[PDB]
Design an enzyme around this catalytic site. Structure first.
Site, PDB file in Angstrom:
ATOM      1  N   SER A 212      -0.431  15.710 -11.978  1.00 19.66           N
ATOM      2  CA  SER A 212      -0.637  15.355 -13.374  1.00 19.66           C
ATOM      3  C   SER A 212      -0.886  16.622 -14.186  1.00 19.66           C
ATOM      4  O   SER A 212      -1.450  17.603 -13.693  1.00 19.66           O
ATOM      5  CB  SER A 212      -1.830  14.395 -13.483  1.00 19.66           C
ATOM      6  OG  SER A 212      -2.184  14.192 -14.832  1.00 19.66           O
TER       7      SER A 212
ATOM      8  N   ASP B 115       0.840  -1.197   0.000  1.00 12.43           N
ATOM      9  CA  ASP B 115       0.000   0.000   0.000  1.00 12.43           C
ATOM     10  C   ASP B 115       0.877   1.250   0.000  1.00 12.43           C
ATOM     11  O   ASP B 115       1.365   1.667   1.059  1.00 12.43           O
ATOM     12  CB  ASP B 115      -0.906   0.011   1.228  1.00 12.43           C
ATOM     13  CG  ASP B 115      -1.837   1.202   1.262  1.00 12.43           C
ATOM     14  OD1 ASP B 115      -1.920   1.921   0.253  1.00 12.43           O
ATOM     15  OD2 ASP B 115      -2.483   1.411   2.325  1.00 12.43           O
TER      16      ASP B 115
HETATM   17  N1  LIG Z   1      -4.681   3.148   0.590  1.00 11.55           N
HETATM   18  C1  LIG Z   1      -4.183   4.235   1.369  1.00 11.55           C
HETATM   19  C2  LIG Z   1      -4.997   4.697   2.611  1.00 11.55           C
HETATM   20  O1  LIG Z   1      -6.187   4.250   2.715  1.00 11.55           O
HETATM   21  N2  LIG Z   1      -4.560   5.527   3.577  1.00 11.55           N
HETATM   22  C3  LIG Z   1      -5.223   6.024   4.742  1.00 11.55           C
HETATM   23  C4  LIG Z   1      -6.332   7.044   4.330  1.00 11.55           C
HETATM   24  C5  LIG Z   1      -6.165   8.445   4.905  1.00 11.55           C
HETATM   25  O2  LIG Z   1      -4.818   8.869   5.098  1.00 11.55           O
HETATM   26  C6  LIG Z   1      -4.038   7.957   5.792  1.00 11.55           C
HETATM   27  C7  LIG Z   1      -3.060   8.504   6.644  1.00 11.55           C
HETATM   28  C8  LIG Z   1      -2.241   7.645   7.363  1.00 11.55           C
HETATM   29  C9  LIG Z   1      -2.403   6.273   7.233  1.00 11.55           C
HETATM   30  C10 LIG Z   1      -3.382   5.765   6.384  1.00 11.55           C
HETATM   31  C11 LIG Z   1      -4.241   6.593   5.652  1.00 11.55           C
END
Ligand SMILES: NCC(=O)N[C@@H]1CCOc2ccccc21
Ligand SMILES: NCC(=O)N[C@@H]1CCOc2ccccc21
EC number: 3.4.23.22
Length: 330
Positions: free
Chosen positions: A199, A35
């Site tokens: 972008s 991720d």
């Molecule tokens: N696939 C990526 C994701 O969902 N990240 C989340 C959403 C909002 O932002 C943060 C901040 C710190 C850790 C995780 C997340």
């Protein structure tokens, strides 16, 4: 050093991708969702509430001779889709595709939300955003990439996601056989902890390119492409019968349609997402209404270049002193 690991779609829609990861001694192999939009490496474990485990492979730290409890450390995270998990922390040896990090923080879930329980194919997440987003308290921990970086031949990793097929995550080198043409690099802001970039515009199908700045994040942990409402409306207006459905939660289109491609700009270069990549199939089994792969980011607060966009490219996550992103066609 380098590492190279195959990443595989979890289902026929490419809803997410899993990559095998070795944890502990002897190795315990778990299939993790890499991720680039988060910064925690967490796993289903022998500590996870039993009713919240349904088919996942678990990490058992008591069976690893290299595991050590990280005393007093806890973690808790919530993701963009509303899912969440939390628990305590071990350090252990973690290997991806032949690349080994000792002392990596392995966050053991005590609790996971229902969407994680309900997905038996994902045993946890491996975060690849910047370590400033890591949720471990009171001592924030580093990502696998940050820990590996100094040992890598080059301080990079690459994502080469497949369309309805396996792909590859490489660490420490750029496989020049994996893309066509040249890689175009673009500036990254790390101020929000993401691989955030701008972008240079878009085109719909064979239409003319619209030059406009679109700030967003390169996020392998998000399935779809989320863009401003103006852009998304211009796309779906080219599909007869497409409409935004409040009851379904986004743009839907007749499953009988042929979708146009979508092009996004990377500097002066262009990445083309074929129309078929934008089809996410029936909204419910047997429906003739299909869910779109390009959706509005309005009410997220940021645009997201998720898997729909990233799988159309070979993507370089360049973790040099000044980070940058690179995109090539493939
Ligand atoms: N696939 C990526 C994701 O969902 N990240 C989340 C959403 C909002 O932002 C943060 C901040 C710190 C850790 C995780 C997340
Ligand atoms: N990234 C690798 C790549 O684009 N290679 C191309 C493909 C077509 O064949 C040739 C012939 C000579 C030089 C380069 C190439």
């Amino acid at each position: 050093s380098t590492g190279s690991a195959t990443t595989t779609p979890i289902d026929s829609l490419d809803d997410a991708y899993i990559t095998p990861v070795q944890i502990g001694t002897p190795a315990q192999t778990l299939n993790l969702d890499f991720d680039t939009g988060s910064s925690d490496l967490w796993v289903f474990s022998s500590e996870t509430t039993a009713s919240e485990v349904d088919g996942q492979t678990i990490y058992t730290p008591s069976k690893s001779t290299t595991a050590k409890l990280l005393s007093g450390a806890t973690w808790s995270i919530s993701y963009g889709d509303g899912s969440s998990s939390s628990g305590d922390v071990y350090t252990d040896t973690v290997s991806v595709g032949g690349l080994t990090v000792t002392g990596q923080a392995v966050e053991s879930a005590k609790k996971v939300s229902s969407s994680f329980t309900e997905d038996s194919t994902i045993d946890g997440l491996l975060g690849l955003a910047f370590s400033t987003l890591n949720t471990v308290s009171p001592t924030q921990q580093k990502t696998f990439f940050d820990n590996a970086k100094a040992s890598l031949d080059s301080p990079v990793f690459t994502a080469d996601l497949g369309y309805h097929a396996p792909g590859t995550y490489n660490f420490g080198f750029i496989d020049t056989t994996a893309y066509t043409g040249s890689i175009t690099y673009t500036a990254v802001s790390t101020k929000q902890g993401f691989w955030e970039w701008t972008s240079t515009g878009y085109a719909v199908g064979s239409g003319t390119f619209k030059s406009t700045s679109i700030d967003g994040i390169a996020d392998t942990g998000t399935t779809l492409l989320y863009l401003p409402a103006t852009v998304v409306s211009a796309y779906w207006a080219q599909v007869s019968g497409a409409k935004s459905s409040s009851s379904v939660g986004g743009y839907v289109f007749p499953c009988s349609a042929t979708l146009p491609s979508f092009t996004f700009g990377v500097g002066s270069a262009r990445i083309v997402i074929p129309g078929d990549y934008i089809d996410f199939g029936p909204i419910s089994t047997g429906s003739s209404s299909c869910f779109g792969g390009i959706q509005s980011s309005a009410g997220i607060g940021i645009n997201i270049f998720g898997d729909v966009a990233l799988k159309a490219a070979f993507v370089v996550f360049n973790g040099a002193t000044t980070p940058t992103l690179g995109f090539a066609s493939k």
